[PDB]
Amino acid sequence: LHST
Amino acid sequence: CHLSDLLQQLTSVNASKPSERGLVRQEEAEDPACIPIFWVSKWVDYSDKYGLGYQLCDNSVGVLFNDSTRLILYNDGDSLQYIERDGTESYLTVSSHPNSLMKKITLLNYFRNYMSEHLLKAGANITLARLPYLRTWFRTRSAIILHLSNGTVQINFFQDHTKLILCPLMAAVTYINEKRDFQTYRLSLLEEYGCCKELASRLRYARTMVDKLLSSRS
């Protein structure tokens, strides 16, 4: 559910 | 849309079979004059309730809400742009906004604080005009696809954390690898000089994703  | 130019550029490079060169000279395809101005450095998928929040590499922040409206906060921390479903833009600020936008401004504030305290910033090792906004996005099992209003398409691959930033106006692609090297190629030169199997595979996936965007609009 969230980035790199 | 520029999506059609992008699809053409990608089908052309992929037709050249760039990983089957007698000698691959991928480094020769790099072009520093094509480094993109804008890409997504962080994102938060909260779309089962509110929508998709993101940060651009200039530290501006945006949300594409589930009602397909957009709110963009510039990197002065106060200037706002609201974009209705049809694309109608209004300009406002956090300090002075219509009360109708209080809920959406509150949500953007939550996203922005979270992305200022938490995630790793993609392309951070690389350095108030027309900001692009998120036109559309979707996710597969292996990647999230982000389509910006200036025509760039970014693809973030979940399993190895690599990323593609595709800019049809420069006919260029930026690849961020596992080690967070940030390399910008001219697509015509990848046609000329070839590239490794890994990047060739991402570019094949990229064409299919751009095809999906084209078959999906409005």
Numbering used by the authors:
A (entry chain B): 3 to 6
B (entry chain A): 372 to 498, 505 to 595
Paper text:
The Polo-like kinases (PLKs 1-5) are a family of serine/threonine protein kinases essential for cell cycle regulation and cell proliferation. In humans, PLK1 regulates key processes during cell division, including mitotic entry, spindle formation, chromosome segregation, and cytokinesis. PLK1 inhibitors target either the N-terminal catalytic kinase domain (KD) with ATP-binding sites or the C-terminal polo-box domain (PBD), which mediates interactions with phosphorylated substrates. Among them, PLK1 is an attractive anticancer drug target owing to its overexpression in various human cancers.
We designed and developed NC1, a PROTAC combining PLK1-targeting inhibitor 4j and UBR-box-targeting ligand Arg12, acting as an N-end rule pathway or N-degron inhibitor. Among the PLHSpT derivatives, PLH(n-octylphenyl)SpT (4j) is the most potent PLK1 PBD inhibitor. To further confirm PLK1 degradation resulted from selective binding of PLK1 PBD and UBR ligands in NC1 via ternary complex formation, the crystal PROTAC structure complexed with PLK1 PBD was investigated. The PLK1 PBD ligand in the PROTAC interacted similar to the potent pentapeptide, PLH(n-octylphenyl)SpT (4j) within the PBD crystal lattice. For example, the pyrrolidine in the PLK1 warhead of the PROTAC interacted with Phe535, Trp414, and Arg518 within the pyrrolidine binding pocket. Additionally, the long alkylphenyl chain at the histidine residue penetrated via a deep, conserved hydrophobic channel formed by tyrosine residues. The phosphate group of pT engaged in polar interactions with His538 and Lys540 within the phosphate binding pocket. Furthermore, an overlay view of the newly synthesized NC1 with PLH(n-octylphenyl)SpT (4j) confirmed that the ligands project toward the binding pockets and interact with residues in a similar pattern. This finding showed that the PLK1 ligand in the PROTAC is capable of reaching its target and maintaining activity, even when integrated with a linker and an E3 ligase ligand. The crystal structure of the PBD-NC1 complex identified key PLK1 PBD binding interactions and isothermal titration calorimetry (ITC) confirmed a binding affinity of 6.06 µM between NC1 and PLK1 PBD.
